[PDB]
Amino acid sequence: MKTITLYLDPASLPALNQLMDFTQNNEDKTHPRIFGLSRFKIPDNIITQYQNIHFVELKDNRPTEALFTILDQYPGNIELNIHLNIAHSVQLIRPILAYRFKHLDRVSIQQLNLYDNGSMEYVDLEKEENKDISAEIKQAEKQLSHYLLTGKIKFDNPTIARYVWQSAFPVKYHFLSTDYFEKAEFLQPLKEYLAENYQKMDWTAYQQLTPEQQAFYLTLVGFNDEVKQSLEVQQAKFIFTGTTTWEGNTDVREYYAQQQLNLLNHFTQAEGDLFIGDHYKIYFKGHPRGGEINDYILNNAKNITNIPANISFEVLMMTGLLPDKVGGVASSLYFSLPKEKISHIIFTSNKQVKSKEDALNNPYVKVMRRLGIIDESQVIFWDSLKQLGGGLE
């Protein structure tokens, strides 16, 4: 009998956790492994250090049929150790269940580990408030039972169905916020149901790795030594969170770069509404899709250190390298931050948010307020901030 480990995630946070798992186990060069991590390209010179390492694409949040070709290479008794994104867990496991059903005499499921996509799961759970959660749970377990057979998907409640895997397999959920589950009154039947099958997502695994493994992990996640060192400087640090564009009544991208620079000044300069303090070392963390806007911001900002835009913000939490303060344009990344690290979150114009009032009603912001992670005073609408100049370098 042999174990095969599958690492599936279309997004970022689960993949970052899954790459940690792989790193933790990286002394084993031959354990069969299947990577379907859409956002992460494992470098060739890491891959060739391993045997029985396989790669699969995801298509509409499902591993392609190329998964069957890989699994056919192991014709004896196999046990699958599966790692999933919670939000997308149903779609991700479909081809696995189909395969198991075909080969139920020799293929079996060892266990599941499931990790939050991020704020998504929480936003989706809020929509379930005022349903009979106990009733939703039991129904989802029943419908999961049929899915288990054939690999046929039908769930009346797709959100709750994410949380009933324990009715079929050994499972461990890794939650961004256990406080959410323990404090949300309406979710008490779900929290009680999950029993000891969940834990808070651990951000400390990196500290127990060998130095060699730590470097391996950083390589996996596109975090080079220059950037790490910059984030090891023994001084107070502030990271500004850049964005792409918004509804500014212009399609001139230089405008959006200019305005983001104005927002940054409100943190860096004493004259700013949001002045962080004179003693902070300042960093710019551009949006991964900012493109040439990031170049403009970097070029015009003074006394600032770039953190390559392509790195997922959550890598910082994963590696213990979060700064003292984080501020700037709003992103779901704020959901995952300890409250003492949040300065001010600035919201830009879109269809849903045209004011501070609207920003306070943003789905992840509302949860954050209720959990006491942020005060209303920490929520700023972008065009409330006057034009200010920057400093000298």
Ligand X SMILES: Nc1ccn([C@@H]2O[C@H](COP(=O)(O)O)[C@@H](O)[C@H]2O)c(=O)n1
- Binding site, by residue number, is 242, 285, 287, 312-314, 331-332
Question: C-beta of 13: minimal distance to ligand X in Å?
Answer: 7
Nearest one of 108, 159, 107, 115 to 137, comparing CA atoms: 159
Q: Residue 26 or residue 260: which is nearer to ligand X going by CB?
A: 260
Q: What is the chain's percent helix, strand, coil content, to nearest 5?
A: 40, 20, 40
Distance CA 370, CA 336 (A): 15
Stretch that binds ligand X, among 159-167, 198-206, 297-305, 307-315 (CB under 6 A): 307-315
Residues between 53 and 112 with contacts to ligand X, criterion CB under 6 A: none
Q: Residue 167 or residue 361: which is nearer to ligand X going by CB?
A: 361
Distance CA 114, CA 225 (A): 30
Distance CA 231, CA 125 (A): 35
Distance CA 174, CA 304 (A): 35
User: Binding site for CMP, residues?
Assistant: 242, 285, 287, 312-314, 331-332
Count the site residues for ligand X by CB under 6 A: 14
Question: C-beta of 259: minimal distance to ligand X in Å?
Answer: 15
Stretch that binds ligand X, among 17-25, 202-210, 262-270, 330-338 (CB under 6 A): 330-338
Nearest-10 crossing angle of helices 211-220, 13-24: 150
Question: C-beta of 347: minimal distance to ligand X in Å?
Answer: 11
Q: Count CB neighbours of 22 within 10 A.
A: 24
344 binds ligand X (CB under 6 A): no
331 binds ligand X (CB under 6 A): yes
118 binds ligand X (CB under 6 A): yes
Q: Which of 34, 181, 314, 326 binds ligand X (CB under 6 A)?
A: 314
What is the DSSP pairing of strand 281-285 with strand 304-307?
parallel
Q: How many Cα atoms sit within 13 Å of 48 on the Cβ side? A: 3
Question: C-beta of 90: minimal distance to ligand X in Å?
Answer: 21
The residue ranges that bind ligand X (CB under 6 A) are 12, 118, 241-242, 285-288, 312-314, 331-333
